[PDB]
Design a protein around this nucleic acid. Structure first.
Ligand SMILES: [Mg+2]
Ligand SMILES: [Mg+2]
Ligand SMILES: [Mg+2]
Length: 1052
RNA sequence: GUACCGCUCCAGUCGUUCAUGGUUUUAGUACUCUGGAAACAGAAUCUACUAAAACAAGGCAAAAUGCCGUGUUUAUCUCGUCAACUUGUUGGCGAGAUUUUUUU
DNA sequence: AGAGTACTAAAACATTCAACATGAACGACTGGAGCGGTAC
DNA sequence: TCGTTCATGTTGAATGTTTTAGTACTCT
């Protein structure tokens, strides 16, 4: 062990470490660890698929009920035709006349698949003909107005023809009504007498509520109802063993009232604050009697001036009004009976019950369970109170230990808790050696920063074990990046003084009011965009946004599928007339179109004048508003990831206090500080590094080691005294602060914060150590979901049949690739030649356009017609056509019966592989992600597929095992070291891998090359030396000589 | 400045609760072709729109208002460090075997 | 013996082509922001 | 922004073409 100081950096991709000597400021270690980058969309998807899982699992339950009761009353059997009966006619012809067994079964099954929305039971409004479900249910109701959904559906069938899509969202109770209609019609047609009418709708109205929870086995739920009504909330602060209590508990409201009474200001010739008798008269004459105690009605009990009482809290309206004894009146306004309202404890219990539930029937039972003096008559009324949810941060037994004396003295709350020697949550670990992971859970916001943080504990404990205890820790974060840059943007403004600074400050500092944290982005974008729409540059006044909302709409910039950003960076304010026509179109493509008000260049200069001054657009948002390359692909869908930013303050302080507690208990006078990225931005600015981004994973270290020296900067100059106090949060002596030096202006930064002799070891360091996370977890993303179909032809190969949908669009240019390249592929090239000629007419008459079909629509007002005798065919939007011969796939024709030709999924995902050495040739075996079996709490690599993956490679029994490789290992291949990405192709023995020192894309732009950045290598007899090297938690290099292929999978 | 209360609103997360849709196969009717003089017959087989009926390989539990599959090991292999699962393996601790050569 | 011809079988360097989707509602927690204030 | 000053960009599978060696004939 030697004396060392640590410097950490963290980002949603990686962790970066820099270890410097404490004595002579010499760096000893510098490197970066990588791990599987996490985004909220990941766990959100794991949600959404679980959601859909239950959706299907109950859709099948709704199948089960109808199935069994069809079997029951002699209605259905496994001998009759099930397909070919139209339910649209079924449910309407069931309005008056007979329905057959199988037809009735079809109608009932269809109305079981369909249930409609509950949370809009009683919507009555007009419609703007948008895509939302409320307005469409409004249309459905206004179109029925006497009829049932059956009639509208069947009419839209017989007349127009298309009968699904966005226009089948209907009010649920309408389905319920037509359910009664058809059930009672079929009542007197078969062996159905009384029971059959009920149980369906009873079951067809079943639903799980947003608080029933998932099933029993849930690793996220609860075994009992009342359990999570004791788990969701927090605990007491000063008594971290007993639960909190509700926001509107009666004695809690007494607490708040006494707070507002014991903080008052009186300018009379007596005691400054109220006496005990004065307060008691107040509580029994004003608060208990009137809902909102008016200041005009409070002075009459103490005989003081009506307008000399101050020092209290206000109500929601922003007017001075005291904390209402909300439950007291509300029970009084319906119950004057005195046996209960004179009991504080049962009233507290009533408040707690009213809060910790929201059901209108559970509160009834839980009030009957309070064995009070009430009757049914009152409880049926009291159970329907509203607005009494929310918990308050203390408990009963912290209120009691302060209530009694609060009667008497005139102090203010927390002081009493200090007199009784009550201390908030402070963890003790004075007996431990390394930093634990037990204290993590309380200090966590979301899984993203959870992953980004929890491994700093692992790395620092490893550094302690290998290095002893350090002397200082300095930490930079991924969420502390715009403190001081924004502060100087607020304060510096312009040097011209006077006219410039005294006018636009109302937009620079936003008038210096708290309104900035109440307007939200829907009004912030008005300030951000000069009060002008981005896509039109028309006026968007602040008074019109607050008095005419309907003129302008707030929406995102880029769809989630290629942006995944739900923050204040990916949203804009656009006039309703333009926003309604947007959808899947950004400013680049939207404003360059044939009916746009402006060009891309005028908008570009608009953004530039919005992004070249005070309050400029952030480069992350600037790239959103200019578009790069093309949005219609996946290449930008990944490049939009690594520029994004978020701001938070809880996540920093969580681990900050976690480190301080542990370092204070074990008697470790170790400085621990976190720096915002604002200061380090200036540091990187003024330290004169090379003008290049082709550095890769080393950035995270080269930046982090910056921080590792920044702390030492605090011990070289004497202008940092106030800066030292601020970065340590040190209290300023009242007669000292005005002369304490801090660094705020650029001249001070250049005189003080520039150390060229202490940065030659950070900029020029090129000896990093890398190590990647072996994501050995089983059960990950196996295989994609877009099923694919396959046909047979003359040669005898199987062919993927691709599909082309949405022919009507103006901007679908893909069709040129069929006729003008090779029309042989299309199926209608061989079959239906007459329709082929029909198509060929349009194809040839518009051979010099973008989309010949949209040209046809312009020139004839109607799209192409399905070819037939009379040429009056439905519009064409979809085309099947021939694709590729298929070798490496997943034969999945097992599930569909009767398939005249096989069906395949696509794009298997490799998990690991295995090198073997037969005499002088290395051969591969691949363990896919499909090669895992679940047993109890562990996962076994099914060796059958494994040994079938070595025989088919023709691997000798005498072949010499080298290593099994997991993801992102270090493979020694004949001239280099590489990271497993995966086995690109097993049959070809083509494998895809990547560089270690830098991103190989970024390596290509290091050479400015043009081939795809895929390190793909084919394995054959030409192999000479394949070995395993590996790296430790810091990233240092070694080799492993393990003897056997890993067979068992470690969990955890 | 931190912990501290109560009000108000806002955002996010977790976690839960939904409806509508999307992709591939039979009966189709608008289809393709054959035979046939055509009639007509069948068989195919491109576009559509409905009946039906399945969506990460699996594991379960077995009719129950059922769940998990994009959350952690940790650099691998030795050495022991003893104890509990008990064929093993676990659980930890530490040192090595591993990163410049002279070295007590 | 040594190489062009002509083909033939096979292996590297690169190209091209696919990815399941909307509208809602609510408990907690968390934090954010405005109101005042006591200890430490 | 006179300024490298919040800071990079997929995973799999199937083709097209390009590169070379081998073989046998035939030429010298
Ligand atoms: Mg940073
Ligand atoms: Mg929209
Ligand atoms: Mg960085």
């Amino acid at each position: 062990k030697r004396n060392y100081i640590l410097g950490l950096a963290i980002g949603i991709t990686s962790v970066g470490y820099g270890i410097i000597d404490y004595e002579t400021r010499d760096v000893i270690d510098a490197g970066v660890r990588l791990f599987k980058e996490a985004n909220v969309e990941n766990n959100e998807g794991r949600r959404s698929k679980r959601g859909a899982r239950r959706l299907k699992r109950r859709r099948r339950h709704r199948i089960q009920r109808v199935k069994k009761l069809l079997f029951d009353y002699n209605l259905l059997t496994d001998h009759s035709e099930l397909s070919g009966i139209n339910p649209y006619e079924a449910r309407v012809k069931g309005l008056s006349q007979k329905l057959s067994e199988e037809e009735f079964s079809a109608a009932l099954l269809h109305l079981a698949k369909r249930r409609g929305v509950h949370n809009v039971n009683e919507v009555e409004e007009d419609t703007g003909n948008e895509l939302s479900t409320k307005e469409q249910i409004s249309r459905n109701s206004k179109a029925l107005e006497e009829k049932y959904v059956a009639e509208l559906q069947l009419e839209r069938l017989k007349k127009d023809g298309e009968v699904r899509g966005s226009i089948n969202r209907f009010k649920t109770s309408d389905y319920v009504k037509e359910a009664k209609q058809l059930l009672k019609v079929q009542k007197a047609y078969h062996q159905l007498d009384q029971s059959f009418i009920d149980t369906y709708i009873d079951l067809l109205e079943t639903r799980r509520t947003y608080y029933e929870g998932p099933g029993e086995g849930s690793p996220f739920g609860w075994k009992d109802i009342k359990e999570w009504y004791e788990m969701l909330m927090g605990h007491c602060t000063y008594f971290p063993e007993e639960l909190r209590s509700v926001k509107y508990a009666y004695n809690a409201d007494l607490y708040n009232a006494l707070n507002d009474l014991n903080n008052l200001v009186i300018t009379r010739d007596e005691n400054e604050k109220l006496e005990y008798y004065e307060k008691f008269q107040i509580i029994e004459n004003v608060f208990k009697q009137k809902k909102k105690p008016t200041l005009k009605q409070i002075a009459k009990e103490i005989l003081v001036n009506e307008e000399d009482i101050k020092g209290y809290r206000v109500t929601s309206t922003g007017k001075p009004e005291f904390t209402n004894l909300k439950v007291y009146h509300d029970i009084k306004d319906i119950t004057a009976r005195k046996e209960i309202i004179e009991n504080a404890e049962l009233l507290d219990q009533i408040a707690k019950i009213l809060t910790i539930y929201q059901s209108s029937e559970d509160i009834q039972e839980e009030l009957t369970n309070l064995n009070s003096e009430l009757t049914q008559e009152e409880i049926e009324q009291i159970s329907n109170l509203k607005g009494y949810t929310g918990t308050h941060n203390l408990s009963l037994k912290a209120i009691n230990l302060i209530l009694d004396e609060l009667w008497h003295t005139n102090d203010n709350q927390i002081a009493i808790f200090n007199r009784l020697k009550l201390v908030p949550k402070k963890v003790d670990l004075s007996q431990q050696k390394e930093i634990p992971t037990t204290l993590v859970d309380d200090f966590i916001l979301s899984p993203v920063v959870k992953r980004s943080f929890i491994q700093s504990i692992k790395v620092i404990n490893a550094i302690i074990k290998k290095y002893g205890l350090p002397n200082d820790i300095i930490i930079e974060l991924a969420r502390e990046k715009n403190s001081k840059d924004a502060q100087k943007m607020i304060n510096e403004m312009q040097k011209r003084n006077r006219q410039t600074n005294e006018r636009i400050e109302e937009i620079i500092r936003t008038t210096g009011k708290e309104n900035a944290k109440y307007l939200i982005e829907k009004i912030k974008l008005h300030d951000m965009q000069e009060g002008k729409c981005l896509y039109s540059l028309e006026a968007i006044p602040l008074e019109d946004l607050l008095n005419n909302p309907f003129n302008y709409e707030v929406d995102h910039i880029i769809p989630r599928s290629v942006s995944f950003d739900n923050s204040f960076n990916n949203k804009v304010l656009v006039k309703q007339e333009e926003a309604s026509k947007k959808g899947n179109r950004t400013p680049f493509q939207y404003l360059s179109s044939s009916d746009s008000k402006i060009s891309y260049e005028t908008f570009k200069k608009h953004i530039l004048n919005l992004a070249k001054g005070k309050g400029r657009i952030s480069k992350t948002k600037k790239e959103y508003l200019l578009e790069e390359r093309d949005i219609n692909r996946f290449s930008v869908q990944k490049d939009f990831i690594n520029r994004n930013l978020v701001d938070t303050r809880y996540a920093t302080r969580g681990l900050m206090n976690l480190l301080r507690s542990y370092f204070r208990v074990n008697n470790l006078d170790v400085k621990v500080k976190s720096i915002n990225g604002g200061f380090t931005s200036f540091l990187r600015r003024k330290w004169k590094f090379k003008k290049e981004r082709n550095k890769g994973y080393k950035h995270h270290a080269e930046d982090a080691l910056i921080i590792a020296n920044a702390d030492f900067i605090f011990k070289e100059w004497k202008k940092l005294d106030k800066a030292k106090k601020v970065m340590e949060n040190q209290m300023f002596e009242e007669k000292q602060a005005e002369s304490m030096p801090e660094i705020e202006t650029e001249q001070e930064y250049k005189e003080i914060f520039i150390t060229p002799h202490q940065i030659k070891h950070i900029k020029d360091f090129k000896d990093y150590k890398y190590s990647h996370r072996v994501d050995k977890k089983p059960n990950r993303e196996l295989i994609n979901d877009t099923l694919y179909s396959t046909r047979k032809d003359d040669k005898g190969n199987t062919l993927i049949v691709n599909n082309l949908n949405g022919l009507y669009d103006k901007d679908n240019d893909k069709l040129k690739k069929l006729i003008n390249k090779s029309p042989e592929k299309l199926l209608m090239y061989h079959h239906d030649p007459q329709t082929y000629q029909k198509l060929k007419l349009i194809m040839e008459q518009y051979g010099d356009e973008k989309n010949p079909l949209y040209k046809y629509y312009e020139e004839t007002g109607n799209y192409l017609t399905k070819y037939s005798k009379k040429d009056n065919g439905p519009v064409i939007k979809k085309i099947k056509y021939y694709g590729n011969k298929l070798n490496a796939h997943l034969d999945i024709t097992d599930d569909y019966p009767n398939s005249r030709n096989k069906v395949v999924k696509l794009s298997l995902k490799p998990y690991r592989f295995d090198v073997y050495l037969d005499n002088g040739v290395y051969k591969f075996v691949t363990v896919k992600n499909l090669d895992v079996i679940k047993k109890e709490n562990y996962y076994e690599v099914n060796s059958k597929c494994y040994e079938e993956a070595k025989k088919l490679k023709k691997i000798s029994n005498q072949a010499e095992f080298i290593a099994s490789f997991y993801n992102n290992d270090l493979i020694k291949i004949n001239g280099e070291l590489y990271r497993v990405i995966g086995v690109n192709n097993d049959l070809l023995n083509r494998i895809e891998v990547n560089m270690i020192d830098i991103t190989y894309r970024e390596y290509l732009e290091n050479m400015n090359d043009k081939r795809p950045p895929r390190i793909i290598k084919t394995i054959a007899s030409k192999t000479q030396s394949i070995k395993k090297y590996s790296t430790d938690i810091l990233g240092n290099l070694y080799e492993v000589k393990s003897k056997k292929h890993p067979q068992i999978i470690k969990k955890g």
